[PDB]
Subunit: 92 residues, 2 copies
């Protein structure tokens, strides 16, 4: 797949904030989250998450934030024909 | 005369963070406040904000999705000088 593009916006003693910009069909690659994190979606739409429990399609809504814990392990894919963006705030 | 209030909606409030969506009517403001925590601002709207601090007033240009951080201790009033609603998500980091 094409690669999603992470841009780190903030990396201080308290948080690391990364913008993830997905081209259509783009993926993060598999990773494991080492920190609790908050997601602020900048786009409304579905994401495809490959997870240890299998494939999960999730609905994100622009401007509706949510949090997930340290230990989440997955590959995130943009299953749409448009760009998808979200901001991820990892708590240190 | 009084500017309309910006409206806070708490999205997350847990051991680690408090995340509040702030929605500004046209011309709207926060009122003066003091930030008790380091915080992250994720703008949801591209546009100017007018920031009133003890020393003066400045126009700051925000871009949707371009975050920034400010430290504990900020004292200000924040105003939306535009003719349309301005929205940002504020992530306060608990100690
Ligand atoms: Zn992830
Ligand atoms: Zn403030």
């Amino acid at each position: 797949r094409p690669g999603a593009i992470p841009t780190v916006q903030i990396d201080n003693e308290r948080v690391k904030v990364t913008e993830w910009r997905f081209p259509p069909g783009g993926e993060t690659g598999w990773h494991r989250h080492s920190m609790d994190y908050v997601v602020v979606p900048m786009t409304t739409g579905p994401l495809l998450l490959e997870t240890p429990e299998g494939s999960v399609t999730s609905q994100l809504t622009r401007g509706v934030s949510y949090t997930r814990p340290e230990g989440v392990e997955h590959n995130v894919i943009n299953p749409s024909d448009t760009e998808f963006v979200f901001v991820e705030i990892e708590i240190k």
